[PDB]
From a paper:
The model archaeaon [name] assembles three filaments of the type-IV pilus superfamily (archaella, archaeal adhesion pili and UV-inducible pili), as well as a so-far uncharacterised fourth filament, named “thread”. Thread subunits are interconnected via donor strand complementation, a feature reminiscent of bacterial chaperone-usher pili.
Our atomic model reveals that each subunit consists of an N-terminal β-strand (tail) followed by a globular (head) domain. The head domain contains two β- sheets composed of 11 β-strands. On the subunit level, one β-strand is missing to complete the sheet, leaving a gap between β-4 and β-12. Upon closer investigation of the assembled filament, this missing strand is replaced by the β1 tail strand of the next subunit along the filament (n+1). These protrusions were exclusively found at asparagine residues N56, N80, N83, N121 and N146 of each thread subunit. Connected to each of the five glycosylation sites at the corresponding asparagine are two N-acetylglucosamine (GlcNAc) residues, the second of which branches to bind two individual Mannose (Man), Glucose and one 6-sulfoquinovose molecule. Whereas the threads have a rise of 31.6 Å and twist of –103.2°, Type I pili have a reported rise of 7.7 Å and a twist of 115°.
Residue numbers in the entry:
A (entry chain I), B (entry chain H), C (entry chain G), D (entry chain F), E (entry chain E), F (entry chain D), ...: 24 to 206
The structure:
Amino acid sequence: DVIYYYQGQITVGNVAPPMYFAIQPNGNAKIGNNSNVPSYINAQPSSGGSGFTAQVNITNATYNYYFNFMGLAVSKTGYIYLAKVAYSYTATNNPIQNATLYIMNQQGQIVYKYKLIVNGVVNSTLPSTPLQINSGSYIVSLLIVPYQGTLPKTPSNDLATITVNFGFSPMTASPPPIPLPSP
Amino acid sequence: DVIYYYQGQITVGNVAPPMYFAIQPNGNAKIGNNSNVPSYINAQPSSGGSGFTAQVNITNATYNYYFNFMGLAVSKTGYIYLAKVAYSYTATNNPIQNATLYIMNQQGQIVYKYKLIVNGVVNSTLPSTPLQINSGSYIVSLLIVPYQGTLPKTPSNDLATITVNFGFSPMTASPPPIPLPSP
Amino acid sequence: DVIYYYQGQITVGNVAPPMYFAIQPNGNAKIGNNSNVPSYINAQPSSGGSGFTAQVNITNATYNYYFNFMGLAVSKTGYIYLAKVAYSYTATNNPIQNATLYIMNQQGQIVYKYKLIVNGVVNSTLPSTPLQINSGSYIVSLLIVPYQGTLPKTPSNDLATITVNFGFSPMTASPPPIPLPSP
Amino acid sequence: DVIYYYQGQITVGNVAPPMYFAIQPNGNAKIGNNSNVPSYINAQPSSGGSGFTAQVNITNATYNYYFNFMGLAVSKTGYIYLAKVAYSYTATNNPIQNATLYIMNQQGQIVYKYKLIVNGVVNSTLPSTPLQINSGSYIVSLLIVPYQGTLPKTPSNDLATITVNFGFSPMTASPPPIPLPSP
Amino acid sequence: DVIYYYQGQITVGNVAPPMYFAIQPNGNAKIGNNSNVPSYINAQPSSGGSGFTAQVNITNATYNYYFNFMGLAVSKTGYIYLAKVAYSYTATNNPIQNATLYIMNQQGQIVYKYKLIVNGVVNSTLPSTPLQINSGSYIVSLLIVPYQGTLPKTPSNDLATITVNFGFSPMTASPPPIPLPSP
Amino acid sequence: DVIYYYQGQITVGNVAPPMYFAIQPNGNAKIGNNSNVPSYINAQPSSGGSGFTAQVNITNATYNYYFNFMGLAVSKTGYIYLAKVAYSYTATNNPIQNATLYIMNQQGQIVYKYKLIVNGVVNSTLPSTPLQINSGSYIVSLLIVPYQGTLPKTPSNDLATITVNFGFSPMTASPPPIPLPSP
Amino acid sequence: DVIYYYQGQITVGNVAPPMYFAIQPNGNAKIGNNSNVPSYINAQPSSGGSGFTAQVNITNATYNYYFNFMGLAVSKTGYIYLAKVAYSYTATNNPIQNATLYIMNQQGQIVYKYKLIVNGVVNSTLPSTPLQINSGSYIVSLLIVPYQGTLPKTPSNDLATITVNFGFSPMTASPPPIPLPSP
Amino acid sequence: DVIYYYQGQITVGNVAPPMYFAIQPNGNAKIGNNSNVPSYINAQPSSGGSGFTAQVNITNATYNYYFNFMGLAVSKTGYIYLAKVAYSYTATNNPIQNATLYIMNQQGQIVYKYKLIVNGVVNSTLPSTPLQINSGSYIVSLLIVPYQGTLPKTPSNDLATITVNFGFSPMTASPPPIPLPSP
Amino acid sequence: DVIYYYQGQITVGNVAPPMYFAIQPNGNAKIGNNSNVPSYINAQPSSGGSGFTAQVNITNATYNYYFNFMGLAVSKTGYIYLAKVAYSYTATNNPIQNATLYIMNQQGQIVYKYKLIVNGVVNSTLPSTPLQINSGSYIVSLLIVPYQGTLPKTPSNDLATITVNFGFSPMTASPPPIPLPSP
Ligand SMILES: *[C@@H]1O[C@H](CO)[C@@H](O[C@@H]2O[C@H](CO[C@H]3O[C@H](CO)[C@@H](O)[C@H](O)[C@@H]3O)[C@@H](O[C@H]3O[C@H](CO)[C@@H](O)[C@H](O)[C@@H]3O)[C@H](O[C@@H]3O[C@H](CS(=O)(=O)O)[C@@H](O[C@@H]4O[C@H](CO)[C@@H](O)[C@H](O)[C@H]4O)[C@H](O)[C@H]3O)[C@H]2NC(C)=O)[C@H](O)[C@H]1NC(C)=O
Ligand SMILES: *[C@@H]1O[C@H](CO)[C@@H](O[C@@H]2O[C@H](CO[C@H]3O[C@H](CO)[C@@H](O)[C@H](O)[C@@H]3O)[C@@H](O[C@H]3O[C@H](CO)[C@@H](O)[C@H](O)[C@@H]3O)[C@H](O[C@@H]3O[C@H](CS(=O)(=O)O)[C@@H](O[C@@H]4O[C@H](CO)[C@@H](O)[C@H](O)[C@H]4O)[C@H](O)[C@H]3O)[C@H]2NC(C)=O)[C@H](O)[C@H]1NC(C)=O
Ligand SMILES: *[C@@H]1O[C@H](CO)[C@@H](O[C@@H]2O[C@H](CO[C@H]3O[C@H](CO)[C@@H](O)[C@H](O)[C@@H]3O)[C@@H](O[C@H]3O[C@H](CO)[C@@H](O)[C@H](O)[C@@H]3O)[C@H](O[C@@H]3O[C@H](CS(=O)(=O)O)[C@@H](O[C@@H]4O[C@H](CO)[C@@H](O)[C@H](O)[C@H]4O)[C@H](O)[C@H]3O)[C@H]2NC(C)=O)[C@H](O)[C@H]1NC(C)=O
Ligand SMILES: *[C@@H]1O[C@H](CO)[C@@H](O[C@@H]2O[C@H](CO[C@H]3O[C@H](CO)[C@@H](O)[C@H](O)[C@@H]3O)[C@@H](O[C@H]3O[C@H](CO)[C@@H](O)[C@H](O)[C@@H]3O)[C@H](O[C@@H]3O[C@H](CS(=O)(=O)O)[C@@H](O[C@@H]4O[C@H](CO)[C@@H](O)[C@H](O)[C@H]4O)[C@H](O)[C@H]3O)[C@H]2NC(C)=O)[C@H](O)[C@H]1NC(C)=O
Ligand SMILES: *[C@@H]1O[C@H](CO)[C@@H](O[C@@H]2O[C@H](CO[C@H]3O[C@H](CO)[C@@H](O)[C@H](O)[C@@H]3O)[C@@H](O[C@H]3O[C@H](CO)[C@@H](O)[C@H](O)[C@@H]3O)[C@H](O[C@@H]3O[C@H](CS(=O)(=O)O)[C@@H](O[C@@H]4O[C@H](CO)[C@@H](O)[C@H](O)[C@H]4O)[C@H](O)[C@H]3O)[C@H]2NC(C)=O)[C@H](O)[C@H]1NC(C)=O
C-alpha cells in the first residue's frame, strides 16, 4: 500500500482586533453607555470584545427599544455583514415578531440596519451582503416588536434566545458573503 | 561465524504527484486565491506542492476563519486521511480552543472536515479513516476558535504552531489508516 | 625449489534459508501484500527469496511511504544487521534526502529501523550492530523523503538506485558486524 | 647388452611445517574460531595441519559467507600461491556461481583473495603468482555466491565439492609458479 | 686329476658417461638449480656424476615437492629404466606413503614418471620397461606424500632412506629390463 | 759314473672340449649375444673357444654391467673353479673397485658368482672350490664398480687389464683346487 | 800277422732300482693317483717301474694340465736330469706349443720343472744339469699348451708323441750331464 | 821205419803292450775314473792291463749306463776289433736284451761302438772288421738294456756273465779278422 | 883172444824233403806271410827248410797270437807228430803259462793243435801220436798265454826259449811214436 504524505505547517500569531465591542470604547462616553439599566437590560461585552451578551426584558409594549446597549469600535476600515442568526423560544407561542439590530453613527443616524427576525422567523437570506464600515466608534441598538397576547403574566428570564454572528473582513476588496462553518 | 547476506535493490523513479497544493491550480482563479492578505494571513505552497506553510493571525474574534488560503488539486481519484497533527504553543495559556481544516468544493460545500484541535488538545484518533476524493480542484480553509482572555495585548508572530500531515493513497481500494513513521 | 602443498577440501551442501523475502509467506495475507500497485510500486522477491527488487516512484510529497512492499520470513531466530548500502543517482541534483527501511511486526509496530540514507549520503556506520530477530513473519516498508525542487517535471524510471545488503547469522551468540567482501 | 647403473640415495628427514592450518593456533582465540556452527558449517584441519576439510551449507542467500572457519599459522616468511582447484557438482545445474577464499589479517583486512570459481567454472590461470606472506597468524574465510533457482528444495550434503591446493615455498626468492604433479 | 684351463683377458678402458647427474650441466642455469635450499633440501651429485645424494625434509604438508633438485644430462640417445629401489625407515610407523621421481623437460613437461614408493611399499615391478631418452638436459624432481600423523614433533634427519638405481643402455635397440646384480 | 735312464713315452691325442666359450653356441640366440656393442664392449672368443678377449669401457657409472657378453657351453657335466686372477692398471690411481664375473642360467638366475677383484685387490683365495656344472649353455656377464674420481677425462683404452683363468675338470668326483703352473 | 788279445769279463748282477715310477708307491694314496681318468688320460708305469706310458688328450683349452698322473719313488738320494726328448707329430701343423713335466712335492710345491717342448720345438739344451733329489715319493704332472687352431675337429689318438728320458745317478757327487747313447 | 825230425826254436822276448786297460792311465784323470761306485759298479783292470773285470748291477731302468768304467791307452797306432763274445745267464729268463761297449774320445764322442749282445743273443758276426785306432787315451763305457719283468726282486750278483775279447794288431796294414783259438 | 869182425856199409844218398818249412812256399802268398812284423815277430826258416827260428815278443795281453808266421809244405802224404819239446826260462818267475802251435788249413781251420806248454810245464806225453797229413801247404801259428805279473817292465829278448821237434814219417802205415835220440 503506497502512501504519499503532504505536510502543512501553520504558525499562528496575534493581531489587534479590527472591530470589537465595548462599553464606552476609547473613553468616548457617547458610544456605549446603556448596558446596565437596573431591571430591564444587562449587556456586557464578551471576553476581549469578541461579542456581546445581553439579557433583555420585553414588557407588553408595541416597540421595545434598547438604545446604545453596546459600542462598536472599528479600528480599521473593513467590510461587515450578518453571517448567521439562530432563534429558539421556550414558550408555547412565538414571543417575538420583529427583531432588528441597528448600527448607528455617533449622532444617531442609522448606518446599517440588520433584520434579525422578520414576522416571527429568522431572516432567510442569512449571509447578507458585505458592506463597508469606516474606522471609528458606533452605537448599536436593538428593537424588538413582540406578539402581544403571548407574553406570560408571571415574569421569566428565558422566554427566547437570539444568537447573532457578524463577519468582518479587514480587506481592501469586498469579499463574497462567506458563511460560518460549524467547528 | 556463518553469515548469509540478502541483497535488495531499489530503483527509484518519479511520477506526477497525485494530489498537490497550489495557488490557483491549473489557472482556476476560484480555487486558491487568498494566500496573501497583507496583514492577517500569508500562505504559500511548499516546494513543488508537497505542502503548505501559513502564517496566521488570530484577533480576539469568536471565530477566526481563513477561507480559500490554498487550493488542492487531486489529479487522480484516491483516498485521503489526516495522518498526524502536532500542536505546541509558546504562551503560558493555551491560545487555541478549536482548530478545523475544511476541504470544500468549488461552490463552498464542505467535502471533508478535519478537526485538527478539539478543546485545546490534538485529536486523539489521529489516523482518521481514509475517505475517497475524486479528481478535481478544491478549496481549503482554516477555522480557529481561540481561548479569549489568553491572547496577548502586544502582537506576536509565534503564539502557537500546528503541523498537519495528510496521507493520500492513489489506489483503487481504500487502504488501512497507515501512520507516518519518523525518518 | 622446495614447495609444500596444502590441500583443502570443501564439500558444499544445502540447508533451508534462515530468513527469506517473499510475497504473502506461508499463506499469511497480512505480511507482504503491496508489491504491485499499478503505477507507483513494483516489488518482486529475488529468485528463491535471496533479496528483493523494487521499482519505486517518488511524487513531490514530503513523505513517500511504501508500506508492506515485501514480507520477511525468519524461519529460525538469528541476528540481523545492515551490511552495506550503495546509492547512486543519475540526476544533476540529489533526489533523495532521507531513506529508511522499516521491519515491522504483524501489527505495525517497528521492530528495527534501518536508515539507508541520511541527509543525502549513505549511512557512515555501514555494518550496523547485529540485533536479534525471533522466528516469524514481518512486514518491510520504505520511506523516502526527497529533496523537493529536484524532482524532474517529466517522469522517469532511473532517477536513483539504492542497493541494500542484509546480513543474517543463524547462531546462538551475536556475531561481530562482519562486512561483505567483494567476490 | 651394456648397462650403466646410476645410484641415487635420498635420506628423508623432518622439519616443523612452514605454514599450517589450525583452530585457534598458538592459543590465539581470534584466529580460527568458527569451524563448528551447529547446522551450517563443520570445518576441521587435516591430520597435522596439512589441510582443511569443511562441510558447508548454502542457503538461498545472495552471498553465503563463512568467516574465520580456519586459521593459518605461517611460522616462517615464505611465498604462497594457489596451485590447483577442482570443482565437481552432482546436481543437474551448477549450484555455485562464484567461490572465493580470503586470507585476512587479524583485524579483518584482506591480505590475499583467491578466486576459486568464477562464473561457474574453475579459475583458468590455476598456478597463481607466488606472493609473500610474513610469519604470523591469519584468518581464512569462504564466500560462495550460488546460482539461485538451482538449489534443491529438500536439503542435501553433496551438492558440490571444491578441492583446493595451496603451495608454500619457504625460500628467500620467489619461486616460479610450479604446479602440483599427480603422484 | 685332469684339469683344462680356460683363460679370459679383459682390457678395461674408459669412455665419456652416456648420462650423468649434475648441477647446472653444460652451463644451463635452468636444468639443475635447487640443490641447496638452506633448511629443507641439500642435494649433491655423486663423484663424477654417477648418482645423486639428497637430504630431504618432509614437513606436515599433503604434498612435499622438490623441484629441479638435480639435472640429468643425456649426452647420447639411449634407453633408461628404474632398476632397483630400496626403502627402509627408522620410525615406528611408515613416514612415506607415496614417493615419485619425475624426469621433466626443460619447459616442465613430464617425460617419465618413476613411482619409487606406492602406498608405503616399494614398487613391485622393480625393473621397469626401458624407454628411450634423446640427448639433452632434463630436470629431475621428487614428490613425497607422507602419512600424516606419523611425522615426529621433534625434527630428525634419518626418518627414512630411499635408494634408487637407474639403468641406462646406450644402444640402438631397447634392451630387456636387466636387473642389477649384487657385487 | 753309473747312470740309470728312465724312459717315459707320452702319445698326445685330441678330444672335443668339455667346456668352451662362444657367441651364440649351438645356434642358441639367447646365450651369448652382446659381444659387439659398437662403442662400449667388444668381446670375442679365443681361437677354438679356449677363452675370451674383451675390450670394455667404464663410464662414470656406479655400476658398469656387461650382460651376456659371451656364452659358455659345457658339453659334459664337470667341476669348474676360478684358478688365477691377475690385475694390473696403468693409471696413477686404481680405477676398479669391484669386479665380478657371473655365470647365469638361460633365464638370468645366477648359477655361480666369481669375485675377480674385491675392494681394489685381487681375490686372496685364488683357487676357489670346484663346484659342479651340468651340461648346457650359460650366459656370462661382468660387473665393474669403479673408483669414481679416478677415471680420466680424456678416454683411453688401457686403463687396466684383468686376466682370468677357469679350471674345468671333467671328472665324476670333485678334484682338489689344483692351481695353474707357469709353463 | 801278430795279434794281441785283451779279455774283459763282466759279471752282471742286480740291485733294487734307485728311482722308479709307480701308481700309489709304498701304499701312499696321495702320490700317483690320476692315471686313469676314463676319457682323457691313461697312464701306466712301464714294466718294473722303468718308465711311464701315457695316452693324453688335449681339448681346445689354453692350458691342458694332467696332475698326479704318476708317482716317482726315489729310494736313495741321487742326482736327476733330463737326458733326451724327442717330439714328432703327425698332423700338418704343430699341435703342441709348450709342454712341461713337473716333479712336485707331496704338498704340491714344484721341486723341479722340466721344459720338454718350448715354442713348438724340443729343448735345445737337452742334457740338463744333474740336480739332487732326496729319498721319498713325489708327484709328477704334465702341462701342455697347444696351438689353438691346429687341433682337428674329429678326435684322434696319434696327434703327436713325446718321449722323455730321465737320467738318475745314485752317487754322492753330482755327475757330468752324460747323454744317452743309442744301443 | 824212417823218421825225419824238423826242429823249430822259438826265443821269446818281451815288449811294452801296444794297448792296455787302466784306471787314469798316464795320470790323465779324465780317462778312466768310475771304476768304483760304492754299490753299483766295481771294475778293475786285469794284472798288467791285459783286460778288465767288472761287477755290474742292473736296476730296473730302461737304460743302464756305466760311463768311464775303464780307460784304454793305445800307445801305438794299430787295428782293433772284437774277437769273441760269450754270454751265459743263470736266471730262468734272459736278463739282458742289449749290451753295447763304447770306446769314446776324451770329449765323449763315440769312436767305435761294439754291440756285445743284440736282442738277447751274442753278435753273430763275432770277428768284427779291424778298424784303426790312433795312439792316445780313450774312455770305455757299457750300456745294458735289460728285459724288464725278468730282474729278480731279491738282489743277486751272478744274474749273467759277459766275456769279451779284443784283438789289437800293431801293424801298418789292416790284418784279416783273425779269430782267437782255444789254447 | 879170438875176434870176429862184422862189416857194415852204408851208402848215403839224398832225396827231396817230404815236408819243409818256408815263407810263401811254391809262390802261394797265403801260406806263410807274417814272418817279419817290424817290432814284434821275426821268423825265418832254417837252412833248406829243416826248421824255423822265431824271435817273439809277448806284451802284457791275455792271448798273444802269431798267425801265419811260417808255412809248411808237405810234398808227400805222411804221418806227423810232436817229438820233443824243451822249455827253459831265464826270468825268476815263469813267463809262459800256455803255449800252443797250430797247423791250420789254407782257410784257417785247425788241422792239428800241438800243446807245447800246458800250465807252465812242458807236455808230459812228449811223443804225440803220429797223425796223417795230406800233401799241400799249411799255415802254422803260435799262441802264447803268459803269466801276467811276471813280464818285466824293461823289454828283453831272452825271457824264455822253446825248442820243438816234429817227426815226419813218409810211410804208408802210421809208425809208432818213435822219440828223437840225442846224437
Ligand atoms: C514537482 O516538483 C518539481 C520540482 O522540480 C516541479 O518541476 C518544476 O516545474 C516548474 C514549473 O511548474 C509550474 O508550472 C506548472 C505548469 O507548467 C504547474 O503545474 C506548477 O504548479 C508550477 O506552477 C519549473 O519552473 C520553471 O520551468 C521553466 C524552466 O525550465 C520556466 O520557463 C517556467 O516558467 C517555470 O518557472 C521547474 O523548472 C526548472 O526551473 C529551474 C528554475 S526553478 O527551480 O523553477 O525556479 C531552472 O533552473 C535554472 O536553470 C538555469 C540554467 O538553465 C540556471 O542558470 C539557473 O541558475 C536556474 O535557475 C531549470 O532550468 C528548469 O528546468 C521544474 N523543475 C524541474 C527540475 O524541471 C513540478 O512542477 C512539481 N509538481 C507540480 C505539480 O507542481
Ligand atoms: C530456495 O531456492 C530454490 C530454487 O530451486 C527453491 O526451490 C523451488 O521451490 C519452488 C516452490 O517454492 C514455492 O513454494 C514453497 C512452498 O512449497 C514456498 O516455500 C516458496 O516460497 C515458493 O512460493 C519450486 O517451484 C515449483 O515446484 C513444483 C514442481 O516441482 C511445482 O508443482 C510448484 O507449484 C512450484 O511452482 C521449484 O521446483 C522445480 O520447479 C521447476 C519450475 S520453476 O523453476 O519452479 O519455475 C521445475 O522445472 C520444470 O521441470 C520440467 C520437467 O520436470 C521441465 O519440462 C520444465 O522445463 C521445467 O520448468 C522443476 O521440475 C521443479 O522441481 C523448486 N526448485 C527446485 C530446484 O526444486 C526454494 O523454494 C527456495 N526457498 C524458498 C524458501 O523459497
Ligand atoms: C605435524 O604432524 C605431527 C603428527 O605426529 C604432529 O605431532 C603430534 O603433535 C601432537 C601435539 O600437537 C598439538 O599441540 C601442539 C602444541 O604442543 C600444537 O602445535 C599443534 O597444533 C597441536 O594442537 C601430539 O599429540 C599429543 O602429544 C602428547 C603425547 O605425546 C599429548 O600429551 C598432547 O596433549 C597431544 O595431545 C602427537 O603426539 C603423540 O600423540 C599420540 C596420540 S595422537 O596421535 O596425538 O592422538 C600418542 O599415541 C598414544 O601413545 C600411547 C602409548 O604412548 C598408546 O597407548 C596410545 O594408543 C596412543 O594414542 C603418542 O604417544 C604421542 O607421542 C604428535 N605426534 C607425534 C608422532 O609425536 C605435529 O604437531 C604436526 N605439526 C603441527 C605444527 O601441528
Ligand atoms: C667422470 O669422472 C671423472 C673423475 O676424474 C671426471 O674427470 C674430472 O673432471 C674434472 C672437471 O669436470 C668438471 O668440468 C667439466 C667441464 O670441463 C664438466 O663436464 C664436469 O661436469 C665438471 O663440472 C676435473 O676437475 C678439475 O680439473 C682441472 C685440473 O686438471 C681444473 O682446472 C678444473 O677447474 C676442474 O676443477 C678433474 O681433474 C683433475 O682434478 C684433480 C682435482 S679434483 O679431483 O678435480 O678435485 C687434480 O688433482 C690435483 O692435482 C695436483 C697435482 O696436479 C695435486 O697437487 C693435488 O693434490 C690434486 O688435487 C688433477 O690434477 C686434475 O687432473 C677430472 N679428473 C681427472 C682424473 O682428470 C669427469 O669430469 C666425470 N665426467 C663428467 C661428465 O663430469
Ligand atoms: C723291478 O722289476 C722286477 C721285475 O720282476 C719286479 O719284481 C717283481 O715284483 C712283483 C711285486 O712287485 C709289487 O709289489 C712290491 C711290494 O712287494 C712293490 O715294490 C712293487 O712296486 C709292485 O707293486 C712280483 O709280482 C708278484 O709276486 C708274487 C709272486 O711271486 C705275488 O704274490 C705278488 O702279489 C706280486 O703280484 C714279481 O713276482 C713274480 O711274479 C710273476 C707274476 S708277475 O710277473 O708278477 O705278474 C710270477 O710268475 C708266475 O709264476 C707261476 C709259477 O710260479 C707261473 O705258473 C705263472 O705263469 C707266472 O705268472 C712269479 O712266479 C713271481 O715270482 C716280481 N718279479 C720277479 C721276477 O720276482 C720289481 O718289483 C721291480 N721293482 C719295483 C720297485 O717294483
